Symmetry: D2
Subunit: 260 residues, 4 copies
């Protein structure tokens, strides 16, 4: 369990982020949610999580594209919750295009959220973790933080950056009760992905599930999607005492993506 | 939990292997112990484990250096336990010497036990796991399956082979409800390592714990040993449904060894 | 040889960059130099290289911290030289400090030059290379693009980013006569490093060379520095026809740094 | 150049090994050929090579599956050639089958030749290289020493072991004027692969070259084969002084195989 601990999860108002925040809450950890979205809908999620798991749940709409904002998200978390035991840097954005066609504005935005945001968040939380003698920095990178795909230069670059940053984080905190690791997910069945499937479903005129496997065939050997619940359970493990000596490494949850 | 599941662990009469069998048994899984040791003490361990966790526990002293013996271990486990959901290939041995001074006999022995045993055990288990629709093969490799250390050629080569063998195993079973991963431990405080600490403590004229940190300094940033309880906890995570899509990968538990 | 080909090397007015530019010029390749420095001194280097190797050598002081400037460097190279066969993205900057003490301004500058500069340069050259059916993008990353060191988060993050970006570059150009690889250097004996040695030379009161080995002991097993000439010879190899099917990978020149 | 140097290449009577021995011989190095084949044709190759490059060329048909035979190859090479500056461990064999269907005999044979041979050869060569103050051990591994493919367990495991063994070799020799690296080839158009292309071309009813691209599509992004001339060129680079500080690493020549 994680009773008495505080977890801050960026981009957790939905999808993967929400899956991890939910997994941590179920372990008895207080949660600070974050990300853009509908204020009303967001409150519903927050209150729903708080009630369902009997833990304190807050929401900070801090803009992760801004360094001061990310650092502020962490400070206020400590001010409201009293400490920050776990920091899950999850927020991510993407864009597909050949390198020579890749918009500089897109490249900069992707680096800012997927990479720089991890630095600012980590920089803000480290002092508190070193003081308390306990810390768990869980960066959600990607299979693309280990290998590449054509047309995703900025994302691949940013994610690799995260893995490298995770390693440094671990070395600077080694032995202080703090660990830093990066979960590298393969395909996850997001709403936009679902529309990508339906785009192939009506492209080949096959049922959704067949299209699903079609979409996974190229990169994911298992032909099965990774779920937010599994990624939550992975974050839960890394935050456990059994993962005390697991630091500066990656945990690939990709159905065999990086094995071949 | 793992209630209703059968886990076989090679080299589990003590240390790492024992820690793993215990963590699994603690989750409700029936256990099959194995490994060379003292018959009297082995029975005490076997009986104690069964009584402690209220699960069926057997012991098979099959000689892991013998291919047919490894397969026999698996075969008999199925016959006596009813199935084999989890296979933890843990047994290993080492020898230190320059390549040119490495006895061919030692080279052959390390490869047979540290690598070939994983193949024979995996081969015998796969038909059952594929038929059951469930399987978790967990190979206890080492940080030396990812990086190298001078004077440990046979061990590094064998462990590297284990990581590779693990990846193939995953690809051949992808999607069939079976996963295969390799846990890569760093320094563990075994009884033989303890003697190493004492020897160093004497040579340097410092306390046992100062020597421990000193011994760990070159390879393990944390300056803390990995424990059999931690590795057991890691195996428990990998055998869980949360790790259903974690396959063909490595999970480093090395206090930062491989981060730098 | 590389007669008739054009090479653009960023940050080549001195050190590693100049070593590579010199190595390429010696192969008969026209060169476009770049980087900040003394205008007069720079001209001396340019004219000296041109005369010594009988090839056309130009100098473009374009500021690599600016995206439009990097792209301009490449365009003008093509305008003046007639094409761009080889692009060596070398320019790098660093800063040592704990993550929580790392200045955002420093983090941003490091990412901008060491990572973003590679993207802009590559984006500008790709159209020309795809048109001509020949290309060699040689990114000078670092051992830190593969592993980490404490207190160098931004550099480690940027370099890892470069390796990931190099992989994408390769995949988007695979089979088009273009390859993209990243040379990952270990310790190189730079002027600032020389002062780091002399700082240890007078710190332990030992001769320079002893201090040199002292400085290399922790990360570089060979206890020998990598030279700009060796890095030049490595770039030369990757640009050769024999390296036609070497793409999307790294070439570690680190005296065993990443082997352990 | 490599004039005055002696290079021994296992499995060099044809294909990759031959391409490597030829590139080395082309640089002025004396050569020692080896490998099973037709005596008559082997002599034609041996004699031709010596005449073509004006260097001494011998042939030793030592059975690489025998440990003492491998060491004998090295021993005799020194006695007849005067020394051994370069050792290229190239010989290899394969077999495809599911793990549970993999013959133990095949598993043992692949490990003996693909992995143990590298150990025996390295062990016999090291004493001479350390005494000479010069040495270049080049192990021809494979992309399968870094990643995996289904149904190739023994090959992947053995090649992975070779990469690991290469790293240890480098660390044990670091600084002594000796380097040890592993070249990791992707698809090469061997005579047996040619038959594979024809078979596929027939089954798909397409021309030989269309089938070639089709066969390469799954693993090699470039859709182009790696050549023995390229691998020879790669070996020549690694044996050069420019690669003096390249040690304990892998050089992937796989058309992008390992980038994704
Ligand atoms: C494979 As990706 C999840 O990080 O979109
Ligand atoms: C570093 As170990 C526990 O594999 O000897
Ligand atoms: C090891 As570094 C050269 O890239 O300063
Ligand atoms: C992929 As290969 C040339 O090692 O068979
Ligand atoms: Mg609203
Ligand atoms: Mg007894
Ligand atoms: Mg001036
Ligand atoms: Mg004949």
């Amino acid at each position: 369990m994680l009773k008495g601990k505080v977890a801050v999860v960026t981009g957790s108002t939905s999808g993967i982020g929400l899956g991890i925040a939910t997994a941590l809450a179920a372990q008895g950890a207080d949660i600070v949610l974050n990300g853009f979205g509908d204020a009303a809908e967001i409150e519903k999620v927050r209150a729903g999580l708080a009630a369902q798991h009997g833990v304190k749940v807050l929401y900070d709409g801090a803009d992760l594209s801004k360094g001061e904002a990310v650092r502020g998200l962490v400070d206020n978390a400590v001010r409201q919750m009293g400490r920050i035991d776990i920091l899950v840097n999850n927020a991510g954005i993407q864009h597909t295009a050949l390198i020579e066609d890749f918009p500089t504005e897109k490249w900069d935005a992707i680096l800012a959220l997927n990479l720089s945001a991890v630095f600012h968040g980590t920089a803000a939380a480290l002092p508190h973790m070193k003081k308390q003698g306990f810390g768990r920095i869980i960066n959600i990178a990607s299979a693309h933080g280990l290998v590449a795909s054509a047309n995703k230069s900025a994302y691949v670059a940013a994610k690799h950056g995260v893995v490298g940053f995770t390693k440094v984080t671990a070395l600077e905190t080694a032995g202080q009760g703090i660990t830093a690791n990066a979960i590298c997910p393969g395909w996850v069945r997001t709403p936009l992905v679902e529309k990508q499937i339906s785009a192939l479903a009506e492209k080949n005129g096959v049922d959704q599930e067949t299209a699903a496997r079609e979409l996974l065939s190229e990169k994911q050997p298992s032909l099965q999607f990774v779920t937010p619940e599994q990624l939550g359970g992975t974050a839960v493990f890394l935050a456990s005492d059994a993962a005390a000596q697991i630091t500066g490494t990656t945990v690939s949850v990709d159905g065999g993506w990086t094995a071949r």
